[PDB]
Amino acid sequence: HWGYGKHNGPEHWHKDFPIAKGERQSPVDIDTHTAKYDPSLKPLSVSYDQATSLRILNNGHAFNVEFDDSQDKAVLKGGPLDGTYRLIQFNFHWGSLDGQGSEHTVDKKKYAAELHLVHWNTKYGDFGKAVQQPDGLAVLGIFLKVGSAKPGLQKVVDVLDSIKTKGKSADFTNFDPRGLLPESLDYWTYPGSLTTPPLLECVTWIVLKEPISVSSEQVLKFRKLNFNGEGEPEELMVDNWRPAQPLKNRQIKASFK
Ligand SMILES: CC(=O)Nc1nnc(S(N)(=O)=O)s1
Numbered sequence: 001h002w003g004y005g006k007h008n009g010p011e012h013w014h015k016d017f018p019i020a021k022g023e024r025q026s027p028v029d030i031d032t033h034t035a036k037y038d039p040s041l042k043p044l045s046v047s048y049d050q051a052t053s054l055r056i057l058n059n060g061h062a063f064n065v066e067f068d069d070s071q072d073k074a075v076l077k078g079g080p081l082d083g084t085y086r087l088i089q090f091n092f093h094w095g096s097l098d099g100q101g102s103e104h105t106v107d108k109k110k111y112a113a114e115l116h117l118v119h120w121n122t123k124y125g126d127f128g129k130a131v132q133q134p135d136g137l138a139v140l141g142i143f144l145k146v147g148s149a150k151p152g153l154q155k156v157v158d159v160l161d162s163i164k165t166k167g168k169s170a171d172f173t174n175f176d177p178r179g180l181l182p183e184s185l186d187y188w189t190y191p192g193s194l195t196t197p198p199l200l201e202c203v204t205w206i207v208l209k210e211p212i213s214v215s216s217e218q219v220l221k222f223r224k225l226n227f228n229g230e231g232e233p234e235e236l237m238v239d240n241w242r243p244a245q246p247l248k249n250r251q252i253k254a255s256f257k
């Protein structure tokens, strides 16, 4: 089964998922001097006030917080998007050390972790259909750097102990995702893919310029999770990030100058 180890990591994925060597793979390195400022990009519209979180789960690769996506409660629109995109989940990627952990990089700079807020285009009916379309998903990427603590992330940090191993899940209601957003919504956007198998090329990536700060104690708790299931030899869940892929003549557009 795929993973992030020496024998089943990113460099091996192409054997089971040939699309890994595709034309629009993610993540990528964002070269800030080559990115094109596009004055026609509209501001992002994030409406998370009616968001309903359900559970938090350790899937053996990272941990996800899932939301009720049966209605337009938490949606993303505007920016480079056409139509309404419904929030379904958010997940993180982190490193074993503070100088690595993010998937996307900015001018080769790696951040301590990266948050992904996944949304699917409502015109497709369900998430399963959306992943088969070139404009099926919109993922909002937020960088995390170590500094002062992020109050809004603490609820997540505190519950990690209950979902320590692969397969564990816990009820996680009333979590407000607005507490994870940076102050500015300036962004870079480019057409890409999911960063984990099946690596489908169905994502419009929206990467925020401004990182959020989290404390050392907060990220330390992420590193306590396990890749393994209960009762198996312990493998700490760290470095669950995919390296930057070739841009291959796609253009990264910026909403700011
Ligand atoms: C069910 C679902 O959302 N799966 C995802 N797989 N990888 C994702 S990512 N890391 O690109 O956000 S989202």
Ligand SMILES: [Zn+2]
Residues within 6 Å of the ligand: 001, 059, 060, 061
């Ligand atoms: Zn799996």
Ligand SMILES: [Zn+2]
Residues within 6 Å of the ligand: 091, 092, 093, 116, 195
């Ligand atoms: Zn992710």
